Amino acid sequence: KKISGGSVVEMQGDEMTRIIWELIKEKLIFPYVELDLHSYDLGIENRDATNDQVTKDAAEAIKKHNVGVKCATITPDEKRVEEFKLKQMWKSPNGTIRNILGGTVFREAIICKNIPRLVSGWVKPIIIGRHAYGDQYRATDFVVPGPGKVEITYTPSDGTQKVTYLVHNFEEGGGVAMGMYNQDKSIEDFAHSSFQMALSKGWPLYLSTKNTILKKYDGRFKDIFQEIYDKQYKSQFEAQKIWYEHRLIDDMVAQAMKSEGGFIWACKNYDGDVQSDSVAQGYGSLGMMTSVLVCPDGKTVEAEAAHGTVTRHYRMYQKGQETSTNPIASIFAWTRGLAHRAKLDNNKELAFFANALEEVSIETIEAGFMTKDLAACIKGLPNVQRSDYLNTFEFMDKLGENLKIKLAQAKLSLEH
Amino acid sequence: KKISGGSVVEMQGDEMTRIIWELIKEKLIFPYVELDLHSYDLGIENRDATNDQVTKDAAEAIKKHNVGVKCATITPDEKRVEEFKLKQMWKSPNGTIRNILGGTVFREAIICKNIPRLVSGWVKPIIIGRHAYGDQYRATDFVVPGPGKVEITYTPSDGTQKVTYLVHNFEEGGGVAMGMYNQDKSIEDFAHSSFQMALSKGWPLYLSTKNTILKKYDGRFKDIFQEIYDKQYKSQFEAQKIWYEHRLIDDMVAQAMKSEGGFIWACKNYDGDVQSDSVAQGYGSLGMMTSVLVCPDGKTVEAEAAHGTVTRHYRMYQKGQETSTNPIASIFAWTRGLAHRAKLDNNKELAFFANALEEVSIETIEAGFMTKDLAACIKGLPNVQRSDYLNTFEFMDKLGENLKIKLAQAKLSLEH
Ligand SMILES: *[C@H]1[C@@H](C#N)C(=O)[C@@H](C)[C@@H]2CCc3cnc(Nc4ccccc4)nc3[C@@]12c1cccc(C(=O)O)c1
Ligand SMILES: *[C@H]1[C@@H](C#N)C(=O)[C@@H](C)[C@@H]2CCc3cnc(Nc4ccccc4)nc3[C@@]12c1cccc(C(=O)O)c1
Ligand SMILES: [Ca+2]
Ligand SMILES: [Ca+2]
């Protein structure tokens, strides 16, 4: 009776989102879908136990099976090293997976009509296309302990030349230094994914850089997008009455703030990280956002919950206190992954299921059933009473009941 | 009868802002204040003629005289090189001045009660403390033409070692690479200015970094601020019922978006540039913002108009067409510079004048007299008629009339 779901790579995560991830599988996915599930535990304890090998194994499994669904994980700092008794301050697992797979992370707010926007003018959606490779996420940074020279060198593989640039001569005291890079092929794939997303939505595209300051580094992103546009997409954009334009990043954030939305925003890795959280919050709620890595092969995706592990709710949970955490982004990581799986397999039943679960999630919140964090968006936290929201278990039960109803009606809807 | 103003370094700029700068001096400053004015023409034609030496000379004059007032300038790209027949694609003059002087650029919206905010919740101001030195603004960036290695090396001056790190081995094709740095003393000065700004306003302070990704580079900023706070400011913050907290940049931008304002935000150089424009736009208008570099000596400042040169209005001006450009940020660069000059010289007359001109500027707009760009914030550009605004000359005349009145009444309010 269960839908034959196919092959999916799942990555378990940390703290509150790890608890929610299990509730999602048990209450919303497993009762209706049978999967060939390849499970990787990306919990901080397991990454520590495997010396972060589990992260690389999960990335390789996504390349093989073409669809990954990831739970929010901890990127450890000094406090986490103390808390979990870690061997090393492990690198971000999202950075590791994105650097192995490459591509563009597409992010968009999840809209509920009853959640007020913080930016009045935003009547149409904004889609951010965050370049998922290189820059700060594959950088080499270090503390400069004292006086001395920091230089950056380039040596072509033919061995016939060497270029050395002085970064800084630390004359007195120390500081910090770093090197970072990006690859032309990765930038070209980011450009193609951005232009294709704009044509698919029928919306204009904007790329943001600071090419007036980083004339070579950001200039390369600006030049690659302009060349690909002029040679491969200008006529298709003109036919659809849309356009592509480059903007300086500081100008772009201000223009986005005063716009009515309805555009694709190509962001470099760091800007995509920052501005996707600004835009998600602007639409009403930080936790109400989809995030899907679209790989350059045009076949592989990794859907994820881009927010944190909700440590404050997890601490309350550990103390036996009632908690009320928004599971919607975690649900949409599953639905977006399952919708892609269904498209690859031409599986109509799975495609219907993935869409129905998204509809149920939105319909439940719009009917006034939600978690404390969302109820606070509507009423303001000092005005929220216990009767205004459902705890995490009650909310998951309500979604499960509504999903069973939607699926039962869809089965009855079928012409004999 | 004119106020004895003292020594001020002025830096002339480009296009529409250059015209406005002259109108400000002629109509608002020179009729009331006599200055020992050290003028540097930072117009693109003069920077080209002097091989950018005028920019360095202006920075040295600010170190000497302690107060600079700067007009908006062009940072040239490929199109500007063609337009002005430039010898070189000159570096940002703001970057050059800030790197020579060092310090923190404090940015805050200029509030007019009749200009609608785009972010409803912002009932109190937000002050951004942008670290003015290093990072992207003093980086070495370059195109990687093909396969080869990019490495970053540290050679201690005490010659005890040499550390070489691989940034990237380009195996196929090329891309881009860059080295950047920061200095411990500059970060320490940025921390002191941020804590002192917070204690001065009686508001909490937040520092944003991405230390989970750049563990050493951003970790150093986080550690320096924490050590300075724990040892020198914590008890003072507790006494004023305020606090200091570090936030990850993506979390911070979302937190800022949903807050009610009323905090100091310590931003690294790049974040300060991006977020200052996002925040200025959020308050209602990009062009309504003050920007004052506060140098580490605690005596030197450089006030500036942080927005663009308004090329579109300049093109209309060149064609003999009527224009209506907001001169307020350019006016506040003068009033903030003159107010600092007055504080250094204990000149009550100049301090009174600088404050009166700021009051006149706000009172004029709040009374419904403004330029087309501000009238469009209230009505929407398609609804703006000629009767809704004053052209640039009419607006400057209105301000001049209101300033003459305010000053005349202040003189009459005096007791024998
Ligand atoms: C959750 C909640 C419960 N139960 C609380 O009582 C308060 C203490 C906390 C504070 C911190 C926090 C953080 N994040 C969330 N929710 C979230 C889910 C998914 C993605 C991102 C965030 N919730 C809380 C929580 C809270 C409840 C109500 C209002 C707020 C708020 O800060 O507006 C937070
Ligand atoms: C100004 C104006 C006049 N006179 C116009 O007719 C239109 C065409 C333009 C477009 C470009 C532009 C750019 N910047 C400004 N103002 C500004 C001043 C100081 C700092 C930043 C910006 N004004 C214009 C102008 C305009 C008028 C009305 C509304 C807008 C708008 O884009 O919202 C722009
Ligand atoms: Ca993020
Ligand atoms: Ca800027």
mmCIF file of C-alpha atoms and ligand atoms in Angstrom, chain A residues 107 130 137 272-274 276-277 306, chain B residues 210 250-251, ligand 3:
data_model
loop_
_atom_site.group_PDB
_atom_site.id
_atom_site.type_symbol
_atom_site.label_atom_id
_atom_site.label_comp_id
_atom_site.label_asym_id
_atom_site.label_seq_id
_atom_site.Cartn_x
_atom_site.Cartn_y
_atom_site.Cartn_z
ATOM 1 C CA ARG A 107 16.665 29.421 -1.330
ATOM 2 C CA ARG A 130 23.831 30.974 -3.686
ATOM 3 C CA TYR A 137 34.060 27.960 2.555
ATOM 4 C CA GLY A 272 24.117 33.907 -0.327
ATOM 5 C CA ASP A 273 24.588 32.700 3.238
ATOM 6 C CA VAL A 274 23.984 36.186 4.736
ATOM 7 C CA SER A 276 19.186 34.314 2.423
ATOM 8 C CA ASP A 277 18.714 34.710 6.192
ATOM 9 C CA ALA A 306 19.389 25.779 6.404
ATOM 10 C CA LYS B 210 31.467 33.780 10.657
ATOM 11 C CA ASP B 250 23.633 35.225 8.965
ATOM 12 C CA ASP B 251 21.879 34.974 12.398
HETATM 13 CA CA CA C 3 23.240 30.489 6.930
#
